[PDB]
C-alpha cells in the first residue's frame, strides 16, 4: 500500500530534533521511513543533493497537495529581511510559507520552532521567532523540548494517520498525552520535597540518597512535560532528575535558556 507523505524543513536548527529519531524504538527510524510514512524531503538523509533535491521537493509539493504533514525544526529569523538562513539563494521563511500552503497538518518539533528556544534567547541576534508566528493563519501543533522524546512526535503523527485527526491539545496547541501536567505534579521525588529532604550540593549525603533537587534549581514546579513518566531512551529509569541533575525547564518558554541552572523555581 501507499504511505502517508511527510516534508521536513530545517531553519535555525542544531539537528538534535532529527537525531532524537535515531534513539526511537516504536517505530525505529528505519521502520518509520520504510513502513509508517513516505519521507519525501529530509536533507539529513536524502540521496539527492542541490538542484536534484529541490526538483524532488517541488514535485512532492504538487503530487501530494492537501495530503502531506509539514515538520519544521529550528527558529525562523526575521531580522534584515530573512538573510540569516538562506537555502538555494532564498530566505528559509519563503520556503516554509510556500510548503505550508498545501499541508494537511503542520508540526513545530522542538522548543526552537515551538516558541523560539535557545536561538531567540538573550539579545536575540537574528530576530528568531516561532513557526506559529510566521504562519498566523494556520493551526501549528507544538511538540516542545530540546529535543523532545521522539515518541511525543511519533505518537502525534500516528494519531493523525490511524484516527484521521490530531491528538487532543492544550491552550498552547501541545498534545495533552505528553504536556498536560507539570513535571512536579507527577515526580517520584515529591515525598522528599514534602518532608524537607533536599540535596544542597552535588555529591552531598542527601544527593547520594536520591533526595529532591529543588534547592539545586529544579524547574519541575514550572515546566509542563512527561519527563518523569515516559522518560528517555526506553531503557528504564533515565531522565535528568533520576540521573542527579535538576530540570532546567527546556520545554517551557521563559524558563529554559532564561533562568540560571541554580535559580529557584516559583511553586504553585
Amino acid at each position: 500500500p501507499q504511505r502517508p507523505p511527510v516534508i521536513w524543513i530545517g531553519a535555525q536548527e542544531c539537528t538534535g530534533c532529527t537525531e532524537s529519531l535515531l534513539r526511537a524504538t516504536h517505530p525505529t527510524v528505519e521502520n518509520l521511513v520504510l513502513e509508517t510514512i513516505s519521507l519525501e524531503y529530509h536533507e539529513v538523509l536524502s540521496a539527492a543533493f542541490g538542484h536534484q533535491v529541490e526538483e524532488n521537493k517541488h514535485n512532492a509539493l504538487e503530487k501530494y497537495k492537501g495530503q502531506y504533514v509539514l515538520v519544521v525544526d529550528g527558529s525562523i529569523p526575521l531580522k534584515d529581511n530573512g538573510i540569516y538562513c538562506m537555502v538555494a539563494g532564498e530566505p528559509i521563511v519563503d520556503h516554509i510559507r510556500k510548503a505550508a500552503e498545501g499541508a494537511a497538518a503542520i508540526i513545530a518539533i522542538g522548543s526552537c520552532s515551538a516558541w523560539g528556544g535557545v536561538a531567540a534567547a538573550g539579545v536575540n541576534p537574528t530576530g528568531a521567532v516561532s513557526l506559529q508566528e510566521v504562519l498566523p493563519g494556520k493551526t501549528v501543533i507544538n511538540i516542545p523540548g530540546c529535543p523532545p522524546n521522539p515518541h511525543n512526535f511519533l505518537a502525534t503523527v500516528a494519531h493523525i494517520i490511524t484516527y484521521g485527526k490530531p491528538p487532543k491539545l492544550d491552550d498552547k496547541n501541545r498534545p495533552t498525552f505528553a504536556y498536560g501536567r507539570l513535571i512536579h505534579e507527577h515526580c517520584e521525588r515529591r515525598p522528599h520535597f514534602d518532608a524537607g529532604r533536599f540535596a544542597k550540593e552535588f555529591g552531598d549525603e542527601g544527593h547520594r540518597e536520591g533526595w529532591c533537587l529543588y534547592h539545586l534549581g529544579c524547574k519541575g514546579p514550572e515546566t509542563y512535560g512527561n519527563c518523569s513518566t515516559l522518560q528517555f531512551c526506553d531503557v528504564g529509569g533515565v531522565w535528568p532528575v533520576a540521573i542527579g541533575h535538576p530540570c532546567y525547564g527546556c520545554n517551557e518558554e521563559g524558563i529554559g535558556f532564561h533562568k540560571g541552572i541554580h535559580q529557584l523555581a516559583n511553586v504553585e
Binding site: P1, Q2, P5, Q12, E13, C14, T15, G16, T18, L22, T25, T28, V33, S38, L39, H42, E43, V44, L45, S46, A47, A48, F49, G50, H51, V53, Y84, C85, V87, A88, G117, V118, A119, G122, P125, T126, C146, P147, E188, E201, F202, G203, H207, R208, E209, G210, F232, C233, V235, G237, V238, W239, P240, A242, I243, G244, H245, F257, G260, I261
Partner: protein, 551 residues
C-alpha cells in the same frame, strides 16, 4: 570555464553551499559557504559562567556532548579547578560512546550513498554476495538469507513508486564502481548499523540523563551521585546495565565497519590520489585519567609540511605554544573586524553584504595556527598517533591494509593517506580504538569506587571582581575543539568557540590562502557537471557540521 552551485549539500549537518569553476571537466577553483547563523557566542554573554554549558551544548545536536564538555573545561581552566578522577571517567565514557554513534552514522547514513547504487543491488545474487565475504569477515549476519530479506525490502520500496529520500539519486553514474553483490552487502550493513549506534547511545543515556543533549555535567565535575548501596542513584545495578551496552558495540565495529572501509578503498583506488586539503595537521590529547586534568589515554600534536618524523607533541591542555598560535580572520566572512584575532580578544559583529567571489561569501570564520592553514579531524588524529609511534594505531591501520591487500594485491603507504579515502580510514581507525577506551575507563571506575572514592564534584567560587581567562580543549569526532571564556566582575564578558568544521570549511583567509575544503576540490574530475557526485564525495569525507562551523 563553467560555474556550478551545489545548494543544498545534503547528508551533512546544517546549511552548506559549494560553488566550483570547472575547466574542461576538472575543478579549477572552489568556494565553501556556511549559509545560516544564530549568534550563540553573543546569546551566552553576560551570564553566570556555570550556566554556559547548557546553552552552548545547543551549538550542535549531531556532535551533542562535545560543546557541553568543552564549556565546563573552559570555566575550570579560568577558575583553576582540578576535576575529580571519577568525574573524568564518567565524562570519558560519554565522549567515547557518543563518538562511536557519530562515526558509524557518518559512514553509513551520511556517506555510503555516494559510493553505493541501490538499484544495482536489485540485480545481485544473494548467495554470490555472501560467498564474497568468506575469509574476509567473521560477522554473523552476512548469510544469503539475510541478504535476500534486505533485497526484498528494496524491491517492495521500488514497487510502491514512493522512493522518497532514496529518489532522483545518482543511480547508473560512471563514477559508481561497485558490482551488484557489493551494493546489496552495503545496504544490509546500512540497516544493521542503526542497531549498533542505538546501543552506543544507550551507554550515553544511562550516564547523561538522556541523549540528544546530556544533562549530567557541572563546572567542578558531574551530577551523578556514586553510591553502590543507594536506592535511586548510580549504584552497582546501574553500572552493570551500562556495561551490558558497552559489550554490544565491538563485533559490528570490528567485523562490519572496519571491513567495509577496506572494501570501499579496494574498489575506488583513485580516491587515494585526490582530496588532499592541507600539509599541516593538529590534534589535542584526549581522555584525562589523573586528579589534575591530565595523563591522557590518546596523544596530540602538530605536523608541519606532512613531516611525521619532526612533529611537535602536545601532552597538556595548558600548552602555551598551542594557546598562543590560534587566531581567526573575517576578511572573506560576513563580520566587520577582519584582521586576525586571538579568541580571548575576538569579536563576532555581523556585516552581511551578499555574495562576492573576491569579497565576503560565508558565515564561517578563517582559523590559522601561527599564520598557516591546518586540517583537523580523524586524518590529523591518525597521522599524529602514527608520528607518536602508538602501537595500537599502527596495528589497527595494518588490519585495514591486510584486507585491502587480500582483495587488490597492493599495500598502502602513508603518502596515500593524504586523500579522500585516507580521511575515511582515519575515522574508522578512531572508532575501533575507542572500544578499548570504553573497556579501560569502565574498569578504572569500578576499581576506584572499590578503594572507597565516591567523590564527583568540587563546588566553584567565582570572584565578584577582577578579569580572568580560560580555554577548554577537546578532541571531538570532527577534530580539535576549543571554547574561550573571559570572566569580568563574575559574569561572562567574552565567549568564543573555534570549532573543528570552522578550521576545515572556513573561506579564504587574511592572506587570501585557501582552507581545506576549497583546496581539496582543485583537480576533481566531474563527468557530468549537472550531477557533480565527485565534488560531494570529497566534501562528505570531512564530515561537515555547519551549525558547529558557524554557531
Amino acid at each position: 570555464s563553467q560555474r556550478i552551485t551545489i545548494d543544498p549539500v545534503t547528508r551533512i549537518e546544517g546549511h552548506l553551499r559549494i560553488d566550483c569553476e570547472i575547466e574542461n571537466g576538472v575543478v579549477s577553483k572552489a568556494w565553501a559557504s556556511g549559509t545560516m547563523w544564530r549568534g550563540m557566542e553573543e546569546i551566552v554573554k553576560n551570564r553566570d559562567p556555570r550556566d554556559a554549558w547548557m546553552i552552548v551544548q545547543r551549538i550542535c545536536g549531531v556532535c551533542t556532548t562535545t560543546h557541553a564538555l568543552s564549556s565546563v573545561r573552559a570555566a575550570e581552566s579560568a577558575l583553576n579547578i582540578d576535576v575529580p578522577v571519577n568525574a573524568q571517567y564518567i565524562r570519558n565514557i560519554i565522549l567515547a560512546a557518543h563518538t562511536t554513534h557519530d562515526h558509524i552514522v557518518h559512514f553509513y547514513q551520511l556517506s555510503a550513498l555516494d559510493w553505493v547504487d541501490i538499484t544495482s543491488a536489485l540485480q545481485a545474487d544473494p548467495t554470490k554476495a555472501s560467498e564474497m565475504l568468506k575469509g574476509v569477515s567473521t560477522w554473523h549476519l552476512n548469510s544469503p538469507e539475510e541478504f535476500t530479506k534486505v533485497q526484498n525490502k528494496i524491491k517492495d520500496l521500488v514497487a510502491s513508486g514512493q522512493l522518497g529520500i532514496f529518489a532522483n539519486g545518482y543511480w547508473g553514474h560512471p563514477a559508481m564502481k561497485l558490482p551488484p553483490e557489493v551494493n546489496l552487502i552495503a545496504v544490509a550493513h546500512y540497516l544493521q548499523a542503526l542497531e549498533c549506534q542505538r546501543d552506543a547511545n544507550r551507554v550515553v543515556a544511562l550516564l547523561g540523563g538522556k541523549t540528544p543533549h546530556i544533562q549530567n555535567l557541572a563546572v567542578g565535575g558531574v551530577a551523578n551521585p556514586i553510591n553502590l548501596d543507594g536506592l535511586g542513584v548510580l549504584n552497582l545495578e546501574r553500572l552493570m546495565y551500562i556495561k551490558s551496552f558497552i559489550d554490544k558495540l565491538s563485533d559490528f565495529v570490528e567485523q562490519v565497519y572496519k571491513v567495509d572501509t577496506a572494501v570501499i578503498a579496494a574498489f575506488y583506488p583513485e580516491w587515494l590520489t585526490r582530496g588532499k586539503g592541507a600539509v599541516n595537521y593538529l590534534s589535542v590529547p584526549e581522555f584525562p585519567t589523573d586528579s589534575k586534568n591530565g595523563s591522557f589515554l590518546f596523544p596530540g600534536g602538530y605536523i608541519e609540511n606532512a613531516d611525521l618524523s619532526s612533529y611537535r607533541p602536545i601532552t597538556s591542555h595548558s600548552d602555551e605554544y598551542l594557546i598562543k598560535g590560534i587566531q581567526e580572520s573575517a576578511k572573506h566572512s560576513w563580520y566587520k573586524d577582519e584582521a586576525p584575532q586571538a579568541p580571548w580578544e575576538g569579536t563576532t559583529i555581523p556585516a552581511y553584504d551578499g555574495w562576492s567571489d573576491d569579497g565576503k561569501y560565508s558565515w564561517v570564520k578563517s582559523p590559522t595556527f601561527y599564520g598557516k592553514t591546518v586540517e583537523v579531524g580523524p586524518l590529523a588524529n591518525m597521522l599524529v598517533k602514527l608520528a607518536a609511534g602508538r602501537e595500537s594505531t599502527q596495528n589497527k591501520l595494518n588490519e585495514i591494509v591486510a584486507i585491502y591487500q587480500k582483495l587488490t594485491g597492493n599495500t598502502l603507504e602513508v603518502a596515500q593517506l593524504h586523500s579522500t579515502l585516507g580521511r575515511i580510514i582515519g575515522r574508522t581507525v578512531h572508532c575501533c580504538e575507542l572500544q578499548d577506551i570504553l573497556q579501560n575507563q569502565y574498569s578504572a571506575l569500578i576499581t576506584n569506587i572499590g578503594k572507597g572514592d565516591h567523590t564527583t564534584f568540587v563546588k566553584p567560587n567565582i570572584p565578584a571582581t577582577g578579569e580572568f581567562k580560560g580555554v577548554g580543549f577537546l578532541e571531538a569526532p570532527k577534530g580539535m575543539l576549543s571554547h574561550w571564556m573571559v570572566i569580568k566582575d563574575g559574569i561572562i564578558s567574552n565567549y568564543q568557540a573555534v570549532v573543528p568544521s570552522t578550521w576545515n570549511s572556513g573561506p579564504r583567509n587574511f592572506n587570501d590562502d585557501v582552507g581545506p575544503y576549497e583546496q581539496s576540490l582543485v583537480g576533481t574530475p566531474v563527468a557530468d557537471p549537472n550531477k557533480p557526485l565527485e565534488v560531494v564525495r570529497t566534501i562528505h569525507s570531512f564530515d561537515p557540521c555547519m551549525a558547529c562551523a558557524v554557531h
